């Protein structure tokens, strides 16, 4: 993901997520600091893993 | 799923619901609560291994 406005509000109001965990950064202070690229890695696994 | 490694020559037939997280299950089999007795996918078309 590159060359766009990185709004995270969609990930905030959406209460159907079973897990939203953040590492190294705050789950809410993401909009303040920004970088070159955003990578989205999407796949399907089982709940046990 | 099991809390501790089995002592040699010990059989455990208990089918209690496993608590993987921190919320006790009390036998509900839901989120973060699993049934340890997994079945086997045995079909003639499987590979040798």
């Amino acid at each position, epitope marked *: 993901i590159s060359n766009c406005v990185a709004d995270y509000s969609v*990930l*905030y109001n959406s209460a159907s*997520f079973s*897990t*939203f*965990k*953040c*590492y*190294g950064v*705050s*789950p*809410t*202070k993401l909009n303040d600091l920004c970088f070159f690229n955003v990578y989205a890695d999407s796949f399907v696994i089982r709940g046990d893993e | 799923f099991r809390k501790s490694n089995l002592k040699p020559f010990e059989r455990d037939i208990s089918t209690e619901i496993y608590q993987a*997280g*921190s*919320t006790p299950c009390n036998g509900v089999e839901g*989120f*973060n609560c699993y049934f340890p007795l997994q079945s086997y996918g045995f079909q003639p078309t499987n590979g040798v291994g």
Partner: nanobody
Amino acid sequence: QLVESGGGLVEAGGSLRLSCVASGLTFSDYTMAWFRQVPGQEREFVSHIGWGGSETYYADSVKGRFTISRDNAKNAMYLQMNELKPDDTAVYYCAADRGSSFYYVRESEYTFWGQGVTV
């Protein structure tokens, strides 16, 4: 895994200090929380602290009363009470996790859990 201290009978208005010590975690890249247990009812959330202590939240029924803090020099964090209402007498549980979650109120978002404080 998570050994905790503190707790006891209080004078219903004084102050108390609770601690939770990690014995097998680095404690420098982990985020903890405080949860409350009441018999006959579900598990309640009270307090939460991020890495270092620069981003902390509190419950709507406890905001403004209790203070949270952490210190890496001993692999432990300190929770201090200031009101101790005769309604908050309950069972105290110390949680921890690698990261911080948006659904930080959910109990399922804390893989690690400690022992219990005196009811």
